[PDB]
């Protein structure tokens, strides 16, 4: 049995930590909502 707990406001924060790259990927989406890499 599942329940929810509040964790915060939804707000842009100036000088967050900045990270991650920006990959361009060919992908396919199947009927079960699973993405896969096309090559």
């Amino acid at each position: 049995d599942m329940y929810i707990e509040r964790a915060g406001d939804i707000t842009w924060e100036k000088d967050a930590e900045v990270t991650g790259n920006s990959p361009r990927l060919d992908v396919a989406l199947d009927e079960s909502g699973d993405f896969s890499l096309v090559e």
Partner: protein, 156 residues
């Protein structure tokens, strides 16, 4: 139940201790998460109940108490923030430039950030604090890392 706008953890007691299975967004009295988090099950908020209203396994989205409310979109240019709510850790904003998922039905923004599966449903924000989609559905690359779509639903 608690109906204040904001980000919420999704918990179960059906395993060892209390386990965080994912995250979601309360906006305009509607609770928004990913389908793979709840599998469409009911939720508790205090002694209040949240019943599913809309869902789609293919979009991997579900709404509670009413229709999907989040309609903002990635501009295709600007840096965004994942409001990550990891299991047992405080909400933390992480700012990133989304890559692109290229699909036969069109391009989708994507964010390349590693977080445990229980973070599924954390919202992705634009510079104005608008939810442009959820984090948790995508693809595992060579790195063993995860790249998530920016999943968004339609507002009617």
């Amino acid at each position: 139940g608690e109906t204040t706008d904001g980000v919420y953890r999704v918990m179960t007691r059906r395993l060892l201790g209390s386990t965080q299975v994912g995250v979601g967004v309360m906006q305009e009295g509607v609770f928004h998460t990913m389908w793979h988090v709840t599998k469409g099950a009911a939720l508790r908020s205090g002694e209040g109940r949240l019943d599913p209203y809309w869902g789609d396994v293919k979009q991997d989205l579900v709404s509670y108490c009413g229709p999907w409310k989040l309609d903002a979109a990635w501009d295709g240019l600007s840096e965004v923030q994942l409001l990550a709510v990891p299991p047992g850790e405080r909400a933390k904003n992480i700012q990133t430039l989304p890559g692109i998922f290229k699909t036969k039905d069109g391009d989708i923004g994507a964010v390349a950030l590693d977080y445990p599966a229980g973070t599924s449903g954390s919202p992705i924000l634009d510079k104005c604090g608008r939810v442009i989609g959820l984090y948790g559905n995508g693809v595992v690359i060579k790195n063993g890392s995860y790249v998530s779509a920016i999943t968004q639903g339609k507002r009617e």
